Design a protein around this ligand. Structure first.
Ligand SMILES: *[C@@H]1O[C@H](CO)[C@@H](O[C@@H]2O[C@H](CO)[C@@H](O[C@@H]3O[C@H](CO)[C@@H](O)[C@H](O)[C@@H]3O)[C@H](O)[C@H]2NC(C)=O)[C@H](O)[C@H]1NC(C)=O
Ligand SMILES: *[C@@H]1O[C@H](CO)[C@@H](O[C@@H]2O[C@H](CO)[C@@H](O)[C@H](O)[C@H]2NC(C)=O)[C@H](O)[C@H]1NC(C)=O
Ligand SMILES: *[C@@H]1O[C@H](CO)[C@@H](O[C@@H]2O[C@H](CO)[C@@H](O)[C@H](O)[C@H]2NC(C)=O)[C@H](O)[C@H]1NC(C)=O
Ligand SMILES: *[C@@H]1O[C@H](CO)[C@@H](O)[C@H](O)[C@H]1NC(C)=O
Ligand SMILES: *[C@@H]1O[C@H](CO)[C@@H](O)[C@H](O)[C@H]1NC(C)=O
Lengths: 578, 588
């Protein structure tokens, strides 16, 4: 995971281990009677548009595929629920309503939008959990036989409170003065205009509307899905589906003193550590099954391939190497028993054996235990036994071209980014500040061939590439040459103590590599390249796609600038020390 | 019955009227919630019912407005109160609720009634059984809701005496739901006929789905006959209107509310809100005031361990434009602000109220500004005047996938579309840990106070399956603490061979960790804060953006935490370099 075919000796981190679930249990309350749905809606002439009835539905099991398989019933544009997943959710306090309307203006008076009837009486929130279903009445039952439905919503002054009828009646209010007798002002009553098909060659179809309201889930549920129930299993990392609170963990007996009305347990930070079974009234504690971190200890790629493994913060007996029935990284088991597993305050050590010697410390393990490679040759762990000068000067000056880096080869990208204010200039100034401050560091602070030779195995610039190539380049990244050129002017062995000056060069290198690789990130868009997106996509969503791309790239480069400032502070302190 | 009018009395509600707002169970947590409640120390009516004029019935049943709730209670001795009928107009043209208490049946009924002007009930059952007791009305039609159960009160009879019932009821109606909360308790003395200053949790009793429009509050009485006319014993009930508020509750071990605090009553109350604790000495910033000019408000207190006296500083406003009277309004005025009886003094910062400016000078304790400081001194009051160990922190690590995506493989798949945006976080945390290890080696390797807020835990192994502490709760979601390399014993051996400055770092780390773990509850503009519910209710095409918004929010939170950790690490390393006896994560 280090992207290398050789690895120096040390302790490293690769991934984490977790215990997978082995089976599934589902508990749901039992309701013998099937939930009536044809009776509640498929019935005689529906409730009036002005005074629509409401029917509470409770304590029933409903299957909604019957509406699918029977008749057209167009619309059915659910607003906040998956139409297919309706049979997988257990409901609460569901309401049904009977509606009558012409249908010519049904689109405007549709839920979530303003319409004539919608602005007259019936008001809905910005979004509702239920679904709107319009029963498109076909001919010979669409009042083709004759007109009926005396009531109509001819007039209404303004909208009303949410979920309210239109029992308001009486003649229209004359503009000159409030009207009572309709004598000189044509003040009409607000209804009586239904005329379905008396002489209409082309007209409207009855659109009886039903809408639901649900998803509380805090109180005990009443309407619940037709999903079956099985016996429950305790003391195992299993998947549970208690009344809808699906999760993974271990269920155990508990001593919590719930009051009768209380159902769901909670914890310090929004985690259900307790639950009540639907069928049998009993209290259960939930605890996530075991997981932890893994570290690999190696003594050197050239030296030997024998390694050791350290499991972080787990008890050896509970998670040994012989429980590989569901553990992550199944094949990465390290034989059956590599060595005597050892217990440390940090966890479990496998592949090594513990000695009774007090040697000098090496690649370390937590709580004062150091490992070593020693005599045939194997890995040991023990308790540690008590028993020139190099300082950084300044980092490599750098600069970034905002319009080149983000909006490359796209004037339209720059045009759209222009609406983001000026988020490139101030960053340019911020980089320039540390850039010019490095020069004053060098001026304030102020064998050689051997040091120059040793360092130059990993350096940048050299001939500083002032012409043709190189050194990453492109995407508007440049290196500012130092102002003071080389007017500034045991060790020969491989055992070089020059860790400090190599450290800053390395860290800058990985910072630059991370920044340049950030461009390969998709950010969840269709494509990470602007030309392809512009070519084969329309503007309306192209703007939002490029907007998200701009946000991601600017966020990444802001983080890079912040890291540069943080490192520049330390380099400043080190320079002032010297 | 040719009765005369009476003046209703007034009483103080004290610290009563706290009820469980939610069905969940919590323990040892300090939860805060906003809901309708009876404000602490509010005026409550004292409707008193007796056999007036030595046997003349007192029609003390006005048509009280229902409004937004009630705190109906009683200090009743024997069974004399029944009925809480409600209605918009109280006639045959209005749907109305009715609650009788026949023996052991509530008979909660929703029918249109031709209501009696002054309805009552017979506490003594009529002779030959089948007591009529139906003078309350004469006509019933359009019965929608009927409910029968055990009596709404199962209170024991008055028995021999010397003790009385204290039935407490709360009625609430919201969004077509009618909730009835109840609680009972005995009483010791009746000399003032006043509610004792005691907490009272009001458990839920009944919930009804009726969505009837209601605007008025009525009451019934239970008296059989003249034991001329109709007479009974003695009883009394109070009415407390309801308004929205915000409270901080204190769940105990077993999960029962023992005491709560209002959040707008006094300056100390609001300070305890903004600190989320029941104990506070110093200066704190609470809120800001705006005039329908604006400014900020700060509270100066000597410490809850000493006194409840306070003082208020308004920043950037002269004392002229904001006197004490404006507290009757503005939405920043539930305040008392006392008055100008305590002299108001103007400083450079702004307007200070609640302190007296002395003519002396001392070394000051609470810094106000511009050379002015306040202190608690001698009787005793707040007076303002003019003034006259090295840390070395704890290693921490975080897990990307499980924290961002808790037990969801689809969320992991979508996160991998972000690629590697937190491997650098792991590198930064590991480098920081190596940094403190090197600092300890440099400061201690050249050849006992032992404070405990550190405790003697066993590093909190995986055996945490049994409150659940605070470290175990944060152990989940992937926030672990790696153990130090050097144990305390060898540090002591090195020392042998050779306190706020330490507590502040630990407190800062703890509060940062708590903020990070609490940030998960943020909605972030989605419809739910749990991915499982999103999968259950939503299809993938929009669930992906819904999850993406939370992913962006959580990534921002993690990046912020990492930046704060780096900035703190720089300072602690500077201190370690400055530190050129053994203490927990420090030196003396
Ligand atoms: C106090 O007043 C209530 C007012 O309703 C009385 O309610 C009684 O309730 C029961 C059960 O609902 C009724 O029984 C019903 O009718 C017959 C029995 O007569 C039988 O077919 C069933 O048992 C059916 O549920 C009963 O009729 C009804 N009382 C009257 C007078 O109608 C209650 O009995 C009264 N006394 C108490 C609570 O001690
Ligand atoms: C309440 O009951 C009725 C009204 O609901 C009234 O009682 C009678 O009211 C009429 C109205 O003129 C009088 O003529 C009768 O003399 C009243 N009868 C009695 C017995 O008082 C009255 O308003 C109220 N009181 C009573 C006792 O009924
Ligand atoms: C509930 O009250 C309504 C309102 O009076 C009654 O509705 C009446 O029903 C009859 C039956 O055809 C109609 O002729 C009337 O016009 C209706 N009155 C209206 C609409 O105001 C209803 O009957 C009552 N329900 C009962 C008594 O069970
Ligand atoms: C309820 O009825 C009253 C009539 O007393 C009316 O004024 C009010 O608008 C109705 N609705 C509500 C929500 O109060
Ligand atoms: C909780 O209930 C137990 C069981 O009787 C009791 O001993 C204890 O005092 C109660 N209160 C607390 C705070 O534990």
């Amino acid at each position: 995971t280090l992207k290398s075919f050789t690895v120096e000796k040390g302790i490293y981190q690769t991934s984490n281990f977790r215990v997978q679930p082995t089976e599934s249990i589902v508990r749901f309350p039992n309701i013998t009677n099937l939930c009536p749905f044809d009776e509640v809606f498929n019935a005689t002439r529906f409730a009036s548009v002005y005074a629509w009835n409401r029917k509470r539905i409770s304590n029933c099991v409903a299957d909604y595929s019957v509406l699918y398989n029977l008749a057209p019933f167009f619309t059915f544009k659910c607003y906040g629920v998956s139409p297919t997943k309706l049979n997988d959710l257990c409901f609460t306090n569901v309401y049904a309503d009977s509606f009558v309307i012409r249908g010519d203006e049904v689109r405007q008076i549709a839920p979530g939008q303003t319409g004539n009837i919608a602005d007259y009486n019936y008001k809905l929130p910005d979004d509702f959990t239920g679904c709107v279903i319009a029963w498109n009445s076909n001919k010979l039952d669409s009042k083709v036989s004759g007109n009926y439905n005396y009531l109509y919503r001819l007039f209404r002054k303004s909208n009303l409170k949410p979920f309210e009828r239109d029992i308001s009646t009486e003649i229209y209010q004359a503009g000159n003065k409030p009207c009572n007798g309709v004598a000189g002002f044509n003040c009409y009553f607000p209804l009586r205009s239904y005329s379905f098909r008396p002489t209409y060659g082309v007209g409207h179809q009855p659109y009886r509307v039903v809408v639901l309201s649900f998803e509380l889930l805090h109180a005990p549920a009443t309407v619940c899905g037709p999903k079956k129930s099985t016996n429950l299993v305790k003391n195992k990392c299993v998947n549970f589906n208690f009344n809808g609170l699906k999760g993974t963990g271990v269920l155990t007996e508990s001593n919590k003193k719930f009051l009768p009305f209380q159902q769901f347990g909670r914890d310090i930070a929004d985690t259900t550590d307790a639950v009540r079974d639907p069928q049998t009234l009993e209290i259960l504690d939930i605890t996530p099954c075991s997981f932890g971190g893994v570290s690999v200890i190696t003594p050197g790629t050239n030296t030997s391939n024998q390694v050791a493994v350290l499991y972080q913060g787990v008890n050896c007996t509970e998670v040994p190497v012989a429980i590989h029935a569901d553990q992550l990284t199944p094949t990465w088991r390290v034989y059956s028993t590599g060595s005597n597993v050892f217990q440390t305050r940090a966890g479990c050590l496998i592949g090594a054996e513990y000695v009774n010697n007090s040697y000098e410390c090496d690649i370390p393990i937590g709580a004062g235990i150091c490992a070593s490679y020693q005599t045939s040759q194997s890995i040991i762990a023990y308790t540690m036994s008590l028993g020139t000068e190099i300082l950084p000067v300044s980092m490599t000056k750098t600069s970034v071209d905002c319009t080149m880096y983000i909006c490359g080869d796209s004037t339209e990208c720059s045009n759209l980014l222009l609406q983001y204010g000026s988020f490139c200039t101030q960053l340019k100034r911020a980089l320039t500040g540390i850039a010019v401050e490095q020069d004053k560091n060098t001026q304030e602070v102020f064998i050689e061939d051997l040091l120059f030779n040793k360092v130059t195995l990993a350096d940048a610039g050299f001939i500083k590439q002032y012409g043709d190539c190189c050194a990453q380049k492109f995407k508007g990244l440049t290196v500012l040459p130092p102002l003071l050129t080389d007017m500034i002017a045991s060790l020969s062995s491989t055992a070089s103590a020059l860790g400090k000056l190599q450290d800053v060069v390395n860290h800058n290198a990985q910072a630059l590599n991370t920044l340049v690789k950030q461009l390969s990130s998709k950010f969840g868009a269709i494509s990470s390249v602007l030309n392809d997106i512009f070519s084969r996509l329309d503007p309306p969503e192209a703007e939002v796609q490029i907007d998200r791309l701009i946000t991601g790239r600017l966020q990444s480069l802001q983080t890079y600038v912040t890291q540069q400032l943080i490192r520049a502070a330390e380099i400043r302190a080190s320079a002032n020390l010297a």
